[PDB]
Design a protein around this motif. Structure first.
Motif, PDB file in Angstrom:
ATOM      1  N   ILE A   2      94.435  40.513 -88.773  1.00  9.82           N
ATOM      2  CA  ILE A   2      95.355  39.862 -87.849  1.00  9.82           C
ATOM      3  C   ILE A   2      94.535  39.141 -86.787  1.00  9.82           C
ATOM      4  O   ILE A   2      93.950  39.774 -85.905  1.00  9.82           O
ATOM      5  N   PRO A  31     100.447  36.583 -83.040  1.00 11.69           N
ATOM      6  CA  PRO A  31     101.191  37.818 -83.351  1.00 11.69           C
ATOM      7  C   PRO A  31     101.143  38.860 -82.246  1.00 11.69           C
ATOM      8  O   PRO A  31     102.141  39.555 -82.019  1.00 11.69           O
ATOM      9  CB  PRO A  31     100.507  38.319 -84.632  1.00 11.69           C
ATOM     10  CG  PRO A  31      99.888  37.098 -85.234  1.00 11.69           C
ATOM     11  CD  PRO A  31      99.438  36.272 -84.066  1.00 11.69           C
ATOM     12  N   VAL A  62     106.237  39.736 -87.646  1.00 14.05           N
ATOM     13  CA  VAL A  62     104.840  40.095 -87.454  1.00 14.05           C
ATOM     14  C   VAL A  62     104.518  39.661 -86.059  1.00 14.05           C
ATOM     15  O   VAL A  62     103.670  40.195 -85.386  1.00 14.05           O
ATOM     16  CB  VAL A  62     103.909  39.361 -88.412  1.00 14.05           C
ATOM     17  CG1 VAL A  62     102.558  39.234 -87.770  1.00 14.05           C
ATOM     18  CG2 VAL A  62     103.742  40.150 -89.679  1.00 14.05           C
ATOM     19  N   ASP A  72     103.514  49.596 -85.630  1.00 11.94           N
ATOM     20  CA  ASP A  72     103.747  48.242 -86.132  1.00 11.94           C
ATOM     21  C   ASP A  72     103.754  48.283 -87.655  1.00 11.94           C
ATOM     22  O   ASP A  72     102.701  48.346 -88.295  1.00 11.94           O
ATOM     23  CB  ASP A  72     102.693  47.276 -85.602  1.00 11.94           C
ATOM     24  CG  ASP A  72     103.155  45.831 -85.645  1.00 11.94           C
ATOM     25  OD1 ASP A  72     102.960  45.113 -84.642  1.00 11.94           O
ATOM     26  OD2 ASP A  72     103.714  45.410 -86.680  1.00 11.94           O
ATOM     27  N   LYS A  75     102.140  44.499 -89.165  1.00 15.48           N
ATOM     28  CA  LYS A  75     100.712  44.212 -89.123  1.00 15.48           C
ATOM     29  C   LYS A  75      99.928  45.115 -90.067  1.00 15.48           C
ATOM     30  O   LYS A  75      98.811  44.762 -90.460  1.00 15.48           O
ATOM     31  CB  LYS A  75     100.192  44.340 -87.689  1.00 15.48           C
ATOM     32  CG  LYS A  75     100.307  43.052 -86.882  1.00 15.48           C
ATOM     33  CD  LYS A  75     100.445  43.318 -85.390  1.00 15.48           C
ATOM     34  CE  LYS A  75     101.095  42.138 -84.679  1.00 15.48           C
ATOM     35  NZ  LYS A  75     101.561  42.484 -83.305  1.00 15.48           N
TER      36      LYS A  75
END
Lengths: 216, 214, 216, 215
Positions: A2, A31, A62, A72, A75
């Motif tokens: 990410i 994000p 996301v 999360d 992710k």
């Protein structure tokens, strides 16, 4: 996986009350800040004869600021990706079914969207393009039978006053086994910032962060 | 509208992110309310969902209409009509379908799009635990210049019990025709023969129109 | 015996619509083996009623239905003990009516005890502005779930100006003694008001019902 | 007054079984918090999950910012009344009504509540509910009156959630200024109860906001 700045590429194929169309878009987002942006162009079936605001919520959770108190789910699904399915049931009887298959190619998210809506009356705000914007919402995500689902009944502010309600039923399915979160919320605010007369070019934005309600 | 007609179709669609395509051929007799067809999966096989949920998507021209009730569908040809339908199952599975029907001589040509989402992996549809749709009586009423069809029916389950679904059909002719009043149409659709994975399916429907209890 | 060709009715409905309480009592005759009955009901509290009277007519037994021998009558086998039922009538504009009925038998007379609550009926809707004429004839569809019989129907009321006002019912019938459960069958209806006052303080109600097994 | 008291009487029936409950409690309307103690006074012990009545037991108890119009505090001393239809995912539907008036520092409720079509295998009739999760209600103006919508859930015993949609209509007895499309965050808790839930200590905390928004 990410990165703080990612890109978006999508292609939506669909139909509303039997009228087929195709739309493509490109955009950016961050994000970890929960904000994203894109610009979409009608490529088939133009000019669209329905309110463009019914596709905006189909055009990735996301992009949501998740605190460290909340897991999360999205992710954790990368670089394999995830997919979601959603039905939007409007109060006047119009229902839109949408699906999205999300994958990752480096810094760009590639979408694969299908969107079909039926039973929209010809005198309603959708077929008469009398919607202004979606109001801010608070989606509620809960895990059921090993997958996470998101439900909210939100509304469209109509031109002239009043609201047009819609009930969302989303199911998120990761491609990879991930840790599932607890009952939490995600606040949303989606707005069209620029468009043409026939909505052939649209600039869409979204801002989202996750919270856990009022503290006990 | 001749007493003996043929049917040709092609359904393209997707279920929980699975796209598939089906083609079919069949016959029917519109003034008697009966029809039969043979369907072959052409894309997306083997189907991982209960075949019972598409059988009702595969033309209310095949319905015995008395002369006291206005035939909305036979009045639309050779121009034809189209219908839109959302089918909302009790467990959250929702299917939206559209079919655009035209006439090429004695044959009806279908063009179907079918998308269903939010079908749980433990439900009768994902485990193919449905047996058949039970007989129904659809309710048709005119609303805002267009014809609407409503029915809440159910599927019989393999182990026993029923799986409910709420239909909302809207029929729109391509030419202005005379509108009927509040009446009913009885249904009975059954798969009479299949090929294991349901790659080959023989589907039958019988329908008659009435106006309820005296 | 047990059930005679001619049965009697005594009842008392107490309830409220949009928070306004009311009470009504009634008496009538009926032929259970023919599926026909007649009634006379008098509003006893809360008159004049400010809502469409067609909202109570379908609450005012399925013993009154001509059942064939080929279909098992879940209701006639429950006497002289009786049964009770629950219903939720969900109207398209958002008005929901919940009703309960506890039916008992004292010789040739049926004793009802009905509670009826309806809420969220808009001030601009057909119910609160009394723009209904009659219920259309229905066809209910009965199925067994958890040892008890359930009845569901998507029905409508005809409006004064033209058109129909829809309602979706989900009724549950529960006998007080173990009886034989039937198969998936239907019951066709036609409910009609034969006479009334001005303010509907006196109402003549009729019902006709048959059970069948669909199209052959 | 900034310090208010409460007195209510709910009469109702669930699955055809009648019951009655009375309660008394405290509150601070400008803080959005309230506490109460209720005793079942007819039909005990209750054969249904007690968590389905707790939210029927007045939006005045919600901290409203000044950018948002307080529809409820703005209706007193005349008061308002509300109706709700909470429809659970398995088919159980509850219709409830409340007519609130004010007698000095005390709020008087008169609640009538009917729930039907609750299956015998469900979390409600088997008393397998633990608590409501915090919620975010959406209130919007429709035909000059205020409406409230929420899609929320109950946390279950073995795990998972039990869904329910609330559709509430608030209508005051006085001509009032109507607000914009806004939200109200909730968290309702029972802090103490009996074995048969004949005695219940209930708390609610609610605040209103305007969606997503050092100095």
């Amino acid at each position: 996986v990410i990165k703080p700045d990612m890109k978006i590429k999508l292609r939506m194929e669909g139909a509303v009350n039997g009228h087929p169309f195709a739309i493509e878009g490109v955009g950016l987002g961050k994000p970890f800040e929960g904000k994203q942006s894109m610009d979409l162009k009608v490529k088939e079936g133009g000019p669209l004869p329905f309110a463009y605001d019914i596709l905006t919520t189909v055009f990735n959770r996301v992009f949501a600021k998740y605190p460290e108190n909340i897991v999360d789910y999205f992710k954790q699904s990368f670089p394999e990706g995830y997919s979601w399915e959603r039905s939007m049931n409007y109060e006047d009887g119009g229902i839109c079914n949408a699906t999205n298959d999300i994958t990752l190619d480096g810094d760009c998210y590639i979408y694969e969207i299908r969107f079909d809506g039926v039973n929209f009356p010809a005198n309603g705000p959708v077929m008469q393009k009398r919607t202004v914007k979606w109001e801010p919402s608070t989606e509620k995500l809960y895990v059921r039978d090993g997958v996470l689902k998101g439900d909210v009944n939100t509304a469209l502010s109509l031109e002239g006053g009043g609201h047009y309600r819609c009930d969302f039923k989303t199911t998120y399915k990761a491609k990879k086994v991930v840790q599932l979160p607890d009952y939490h919320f995600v606040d949303h605010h989606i707005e069209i910032k620029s468009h043409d007369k026939d909505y052939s070019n649209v600039n869409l934005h979204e801002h989202a962060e996750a919270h856990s309600g009022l503290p006990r």
